[PDB]
């Protein structure tokens with residue numbers, strides 16, 4: 001499924017080049033109508049990142065997120081700055097379908113295993129956003145991608161598989177926000193290694209052909225952010241492409 005994404009800094013829709021907070025482009029302070037148009041084009045799930053919160057969990061945009069989730073009638077997943085079990089509970093209570101977590105899942109595995117026990121694996125998406133080095137190590141980034149964690153994608157997948165891990169969002173950070181194309185080889189590999197996980201591809205989609213290029217990877221979701229903000233194609237066109245390649 002196509003998963004349109006919005007990223008938010010202090011109420012403003014933005015695109016960050018490779019997630020670099022010093023490299024923003026602005027797309028207005030009206031995310032709700034934007035999402036509603038996505039949903040009207042047929043979007044089945046929507047993705048929101050609270051970039052203000054990912055950088056400083058003290059400054060999460062909790063009121064805005066609540067308004068956006070309540071303002072559409074399709075499932076919304078939300079990430080950025082979640083740190084506690086109470087954070088997760090509050091998002092789910094406000095109608096969020098799935099809570100997307102990266103930092104704390106790397107930093108405090110015993111704690112997050114407890115979250116899996118309380119909320120169930122259907123309610124949690126593990127974000128494993130990676131900088132892939134020259135040797136091929138898929139190093140997971142945390143703290144709004146500002147920190148390189150020293151831990152691989154695969155180590156973290158194996159950490160949570162025994163407590164029922166089912167949803168993983170995997171961004172190739174080098175592609176994020178660049179329109180350069182998504183990392184097809186990355187998803188081919190990880191999807192095959194972990195057929196029991198529903199992977200969401202993320203970062204780099206630049207045109208309809210880039211979506212089509214993912215058809216054989218086995219990913220269950222295709223996140224698209226920048227290309228939709230720039231109008232490279234419509235959500236309806238993206239959905240048509242994915243329906244068809246499947």
Ligand SMILES: NC(=O)c1ncn([C@@H]2O[C@H](COP(=O)(O)O)[C@@H](O)[C@H]2O)c1/N=C/N[C@@H]1O[C@H](COP(=O)(O)O)[C@@H](O)[C@H]1O
Pocket residue numbers: 005006007015016018019020021047048049050053054078079080081082100101102103104127129142143144145169171175176177178179202203204205223224225226227
């Ligand atoms: N610096 C960052 O940009 C960043 N930092 C954290 N995140 C997300 O925050 C959440 C993790 O937050 P913590 O739990 O670590 O606080 C996860 O959702 C991470 O992906 C970040 N993700 C931002 N944007 C994503 O980048 C991709 C861009 O796609 P494109 O436009 O089509 O090219 C899409 O998946 C966008 O949603």
